[PDB]
Amino acid sequence: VPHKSSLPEGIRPSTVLRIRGLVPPNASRFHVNLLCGEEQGSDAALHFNPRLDTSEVVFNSKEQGSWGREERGPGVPFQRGQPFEVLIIASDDGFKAVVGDAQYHHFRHRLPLARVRLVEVGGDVQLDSVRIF
Amino acid sequence: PHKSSLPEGIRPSTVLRIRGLVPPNASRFHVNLLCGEEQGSDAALHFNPRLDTSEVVFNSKEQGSWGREERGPGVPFQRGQPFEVLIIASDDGFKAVVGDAQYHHFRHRLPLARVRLVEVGGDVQLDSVRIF
Ligand SMILES: OC[C@H]1O[C@@H](O[C@H]2[C@H](O)[C@@H](O)[C@@H](O)O[C@@H]2CO)[C@H](O)[C@@H](O)[C@H]1O
Ligand SMILES: OC[C@H]1O[C@@H](O[C@H]2[C@H](O)[C@@H](O)[C@@H](O)O[C@@H]2CO)[C@H](O)[C@@H](O)[C@H]1O
């Protein structure tokens, strides 16, 4: 079952989102979104989208209904049927995505961090824990 | 132990991840954020789980003198058992996470830019020390 939780005060630099779970053996894609929260179909400071089906991990933002320029991570550090741990570390300059034991990609901010009011984790993924530190 | 230099220091949003095991005969181990490799160097953070006295002590040290100790709530470590600690450097302090829970927040005494070395030692067997 997905995760959706409010960050009504916003997230500050040095906020750490730790997500642990398992990629199902038949997974296509899942996502981690940091959103405006006002509703859904609204602005995304971070859309982190591992796609097992097309063998890519896409990063993007969305403002006023329009996607920005996609960034892609190096390789796919996820595997169908295998557990994973992701850290998303909010800094002053961007989001550091850590998967497993290594920094995976650094996504510089497009929206101010103060615009993040909701965390959503969904799609083809089984969640063990979503913690905000 | 683990002892590694930080060329450019640590910046806010640095995450230090430590995985290992407390040996069955442990007394104490520590995680230090120090200004340098020399003896008695200043410590921005001294994080000291003490199995022998059933406490977790945090402190700083400047010009040879320890500051006022802080103690964490309970001892989330046990002899013979593995552990995972996160130390998260922010602009306001060091957040210590043990297992699945925020454990203690240690507000900065020394400037963060003075941290140039990370040391993990004492009665601990390490699986991983990673800086993110
Ligand atoms: O940018 C992330 C979004 O991508 C959308 O599809 C992209 C696709 O990744 C790209 O190859 C090309 O076809 O442009 C499409 C539209 O931007 C997804 O539909 C959406 O879910 C996001 O993942
Ligand atoms: O503040 C950390 C240092 O504690 C020293 O031991 C203290 C002890 O915590 C206190 O209860 C009292 O007995 O004074 C002792 C000496 O200052 C340790 O010796 C030192 O290694 C640090 O951990």
Numbering used by the authors:
A (entry chain A): 3 to 135
B (entry chain B): 4 to 135
Publication text:
pmcHuman galectins (GAL) are oligomeric β-galactosidase-binding lectins assembled from small (∼15 kDa) protomeric carbohydrate recognition domains (CRD). Among prototype galectins, galectin-7 (GAL-7) is recognized for its preferential expression profiles in normal epithelial cells. For example, while extracellular GAL-7 can trigger apoptosis of activated T cells following binding to glycoreceptors via its GBS, it can also bind E-cadherin on epithelial cells independently of its GBS. In this work, we studied the impact of homodimer interface mutations on the induction of Jurkat T cell apoptosis, allowing us to positively and negatively modulate the biological activity of GAL-7 by designing a covalent disulfide bridge (G16C) and destabilizing mutation (G16S) to control homodimer strength, stability, and biological activity.
To examine whether these functional changes are rooted in structural perturbations at the molecular level, we solved the X-ray structures of lactose-bound WT GAL-7 and that of variants G16C and G16S in their apo and holo states. In contrast, our omit maps clearly show the presence of a bound lactose molecule in the GBS of both protomers within the WT, G16C, and G16S complexes. However, since Arg71 is located at the crystal contact surface, this dissimilarity could easily be an artifact of crystal packing. Lactose positioning within the GBS also remains analogous for WT GAL-7 and G16X variants, preserving the vast majority of the previously described polar interactions. Our results show that α-lactose-binding affinities (KD) were found to be similar for WT GAL-7 and G16X variants. Closer thermodynamic investigation illustrates that although WT and G16C exhibit very similar entropic (ΔS) and enthalpic (ΔH) contributions to ligand binding, variant G16S shows significantly altered ΔH and ΔS contributions relative to the two more stable WT and G16C forms of the protein, in line with the lower stability observed in variant G16S. In comparison with holo WT, holo G16X structures also exhibit higher Cα B′-factor values in loop 1, especially for residues Ile13, Arg14, and Pro15, which are located near the site of mutation. Besides loop 1, holo structures of G16S and G16C exhibit increased conformational variations in residues 37–46 (loop 3) relative to WT, a structural element neighboring the GBS. In the presence of lactose, loop 5 Cα B′-factor values decrease in WT, while conversely increasing in G16X variants. The shortest pathway between the two G16S opposite GBSs also exhibits a similar weight value of 0.27 and involves the same sequence of residues, but transposed to the other protomer: N62(B)-F61(B)-Y106(B)-A104(B)-D103(B)-R20(A)-V88(A)-F50(A)-H49(A). These results suggest that the primary interaction network connecting the GBS of each protomer is conserved in G16X mutants, although transposed between the A and B protomers in G16S.
